[PDB]
Amino acid sequence: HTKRMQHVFQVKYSMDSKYIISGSDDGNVRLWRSKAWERSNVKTTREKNKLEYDEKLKERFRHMPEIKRISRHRHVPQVIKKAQEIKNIELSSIKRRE
Amino acid sequence: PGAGEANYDALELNPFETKKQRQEQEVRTLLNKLPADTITLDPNSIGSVDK
Amino acid sequence: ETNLKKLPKLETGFDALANKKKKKNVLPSNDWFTLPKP
Amino acid sequence: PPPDEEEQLLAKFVFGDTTDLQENLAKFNADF
Amino acid sequence: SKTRYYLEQCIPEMDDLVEKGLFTKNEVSLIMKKRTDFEHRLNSRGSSINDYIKYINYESNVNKLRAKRCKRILQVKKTNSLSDWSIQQRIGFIYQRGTNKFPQDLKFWAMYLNYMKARGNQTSYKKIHNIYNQLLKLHPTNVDIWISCAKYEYEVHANFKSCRNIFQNGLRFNPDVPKLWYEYVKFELNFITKLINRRKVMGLINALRGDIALTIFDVCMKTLGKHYINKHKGYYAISDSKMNIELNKETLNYLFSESLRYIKLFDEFLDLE
Amino acid sequence: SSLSDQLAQVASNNATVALDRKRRQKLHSASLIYNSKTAATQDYDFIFENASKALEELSQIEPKFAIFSRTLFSESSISLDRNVQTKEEIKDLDNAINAYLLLASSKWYLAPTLHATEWLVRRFQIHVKNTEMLLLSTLNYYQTPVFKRILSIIKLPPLFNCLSNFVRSEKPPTALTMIKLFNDMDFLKLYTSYLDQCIKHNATYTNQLLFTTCCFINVVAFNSNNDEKLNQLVPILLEISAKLLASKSKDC
Amino acid sequence: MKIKTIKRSADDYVPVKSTQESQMPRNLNPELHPFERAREYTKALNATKLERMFAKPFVGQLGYGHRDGVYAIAKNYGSLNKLATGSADGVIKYWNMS
Amino acid sequence: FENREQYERSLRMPIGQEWTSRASHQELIKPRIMTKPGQVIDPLKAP
Amino acid sequence: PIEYLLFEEPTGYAVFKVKLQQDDIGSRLKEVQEQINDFGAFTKLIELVSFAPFKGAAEALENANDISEGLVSESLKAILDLNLPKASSKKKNITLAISDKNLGPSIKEEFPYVDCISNELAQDLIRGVRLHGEKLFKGLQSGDLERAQLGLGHAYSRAKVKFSVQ
Amino acid sequence: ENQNKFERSQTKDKKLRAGLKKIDEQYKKAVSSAAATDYLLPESNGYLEPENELEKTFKVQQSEIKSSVDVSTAN
RNA sequence: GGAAACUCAAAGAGUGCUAUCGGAGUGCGCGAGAGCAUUUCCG
């Protein structure tokens, strides 16, 4: 998300499978890294070993509660957070009536 | 004759240190400081489900 | 047969580079832009 | 079967056998 | 590290080398610590081809000792296990790594080529073609490369089409040495003499004149003249009448000094028209 | 007593071992030919092979070195370590180095002898632990760059302690400080034991005999007006005048 | 009587020259590597914290954008860095994203 | 992992180089989708 | 698809196999375009696979004149005929990252199975090999580049001016 | 032969059966290829053996063991 | 107060240094293998 994009209407992966091309309604065609932390330079072999090793560690331990509550949260914008919160309480209410 | 381990493992203990690798082991172990709660009777017991 | 074995073949130096030898012994052991100090 | 002569020469090369050097030194060292 | 990776890859040969009783644990740990030090010296920061050479010497001598203890202890030649081809596989890896990390020393290139020509009975001429083609790519100028493995392709496999192909490729690559032209004429005459001897063997059991050698002689003469002139007069075409005429006399002298050498080591060849 | 003293004892007892890379380069950059920046990259086989060439030149000018090319300059001697063996073997290798040094004390005007003995300086650490045989075997060439190099490489044993203001100083030491070194009799007994070991091995030659004679006459000249010191100094010079007269060469 | 004692020997551990790399001798014993699970857990937690530190996804715009918001984006399929964007006031553009 | 026995048997073995060998460590880490670094990924069309 | 690169140098012609590829989409980023500057990552990206030096001085001047007008010559055509593989029509045709669009059609005319390319990827890859210079060539030469290029520059300038040396 | 030192101490879903076979196979392979490292372990341990019956192992003192021990360890 | 740095320690910057079953045959793929795999010569 960004403050300067409104109403994203067309998103496409690139053929490199690392870069998503998003196009807003403001006029811009922004780009994003899919993996928001993997950089794009060719890395040395010990660095690639370190990255794949600790990524495999995160994948193996993703159910632990404190690294789940660190890996999960974002800065979701306040509009989306409040509206998803009221949608969640509506869905819980309709599940109770069901 | 038999009362010493012969073959140390150089990633943790090292009787042939330098200043550079001594400071490197300092910064790595300070980065991998295990938190104080994680010492039970059996330290293989931090991966399970909670009873 | 002795004609074919008295014919000259090609002449390289490659295997001589593979198996030559050596013998040597080793013997023992301001600027343009600065101005003169007054 | 015993160790062959050339086989034990290769053994002195490969294993880094200095027992011949120690025996030769401690045997001969004082002379003339 | 990667030295740990190479050392850990060389463990199953010592595993079956102790599993069959021809090497006990003490001396196999001795050769493994010696190979550990040799391999760290190989993968240091700024190693040397002398280190590659003596590590290769260590592996060839432990292979000779392994064959000797195999013919002494087990009294069989080939143990049909991992223990036989492993040392030659490692020597192939070390020669490939040395030719990657140090490509300007023809002594080491030639030691690799002689080792592979010796082990052609176990690993055939495709590896010879591969490492010789990458040697030709990394050193096109040095004519002894073309001459050496043209001699190989003519005296070990005798494939005349590929022999003439690589002579013509090298002669295109540097048509300003006399030696490559002259030894191409020598190979061409060797081929025509072997063909006429095949015809005489046909007549024994009961067209193709030297025009090949004469055409390549003519192109030798004009091309070596032109490139000797361009070896002189370095950057600027020298423009005065007597100097141009005297350098034409100089290149006539050098060109005829080559042609008389042609006559000499053709009169040694003759057996023909 | 002093724990600092009991630790300096084990420091001088384990100076000939490398326990980190800084002490290894400090114990390896001590070399007789090259300087620090080149000698700190010399693998052992390099200096061994040029020293084997040096020993072969020295052998084909002097016929008593094929025994050393068999024993101590062997191919396995580049992997023989000094302080991993037993003390009987270290004593045997100790008098092997002593035999080599007082054999090749008369050849130090030659680049083959220098490059030959550089190998066991570099490998067998005779620039630290077999120090005094090196010093008072090459003491006679005291006006020489090879002796200035030896004195800059080595650390000084406590007998030679009046040379210590000539380390890292490009003036070679003087005749007067050589006489001040020969003056005190507890150096003089050691030098005479060296001299009669050299006599009984029969390697006495006309340079070090000249140097020993000039040092003894200047020591006697220094104690010319010291009756007590001369009375104490007679049974050293006279006793080895005797066991120098028991030799055969006209020089000695 | 036969005795022996381990020999460090100071040559196969610290180097002979200066420039070559010192040995890292190795013993894979779970005796000498005591805390397996807690140490790889803390490496996973540092992995999650460092992923949040390097969570920088945005890479760029392209051009000054279109006039009035895009409504169609077409990646190509042979080549990688070519991407067409069509936008509202009848304007199609063919970007080289390199 | 549907119960505690399969979950414990999953995480029973560590992967860092302090507890496993070099070749087994470089096998235990690699992504499930090892992609080529800088060129087009085509849809598969094999049979 | 950049897998072979051609560089021209005042001692000889070089041809480099491209081992792995550059990031095409992010090729304006700081963390990519500093990798061209540093050396420890460029030799991860480009290795030397052929270097044929023209040895005649006048033949060097002639190669420089034929490149400077954008035309193939004997040594260039020779090393491309040697190094460039015949990519058979089942797979593809081979690609070659050359430095200029004036040279492009004159190698496409002579070799059909090659396909020249100079986008900004070939531009900054050739820029990287020009920056690192001698340290790529790992000793396959006898003579540095700057004195040779001084002589070649003076000769090319006089051959363009046709300066009367009388 | 050494795997006790390196050891670390029926379903319905088919993909989970295959995943369990993969993870315990990877466990067995990593334990074996970790146990095959002590071939590459740098040196062997030390021992004093009786080698007789009268030569007991505790009628040996510092004088004889320091005599027949290395110089570096004796120092 | 000047500092010999050659006693050693803790640190800070600048510079340079590396890569990721065996030959054929045999059913074989478009002068041709980069592989699928053996009872065929086998080793």
Side-chain angles (χ1 to χ4, degrees), chain I residues 38-84:
Chain I
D38 63 12
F39 183 67
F42 198 56
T43 194
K44 254 286 191 174
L45 189 53
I46 283 301
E47 299 110 2
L48 177 57
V49 80
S50 163
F51 175 52
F54 33 77
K55 69 186 82 66
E59 91 194 332
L61 180 64
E62 208 264 348
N63 283 115
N65 257 329
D66 278 343
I67 271 178
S68 198
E69 77 178 5
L71 200 83
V72 298
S73 90
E74 266 317 289
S75 199
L76 180 140
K77 158 184 165 179
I79 72 162
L80 297 194
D81 194 329
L82 175 71
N83 304 132
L84 266 302

Side-chain angles (χ1 to χ4, degrees), chain B residues 5 9, chain E residues 4, chain G residues 26-33 36, chain H residues 12-14 17-21, chain J residues 1-9 26-41:
Chain B
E5 198 284 327
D9 193 89
Chain E
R4 173 73 214 183
Chain G
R26 200 73 179 140
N27 173 43
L28 256 62
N29 208 308
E31 292 190 11
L32 278 178
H33 303 260
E36 37 180 11
Chain H
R12 71 183 288 181
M13 166 256 301
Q17 217 187 347
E18 287 97 304
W19 306 265
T20 182
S21 175
Chain J
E1 196 265 307
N2 213 18
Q3 286 80 246
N4 186 280
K5 198 55 79 194
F6 299 85
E7 197 72 26
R8 275 83 169 255
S9 277
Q26 270 164 345
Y27 173 70
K28 182 60 67 196
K29 173 162 174 38
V31 162
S32 177
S33 164
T37 305
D38 293 351
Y39 279 172
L40 195 136
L41 204 64

Side-chain angles (χ1 to χ4, degrees), chain F residues 37 55 58-59 108 124 247:
Chain F
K37 215 181 71 161
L55 183 56
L58 187 51
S59 177
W108 290 79
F124 291 149
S247 172

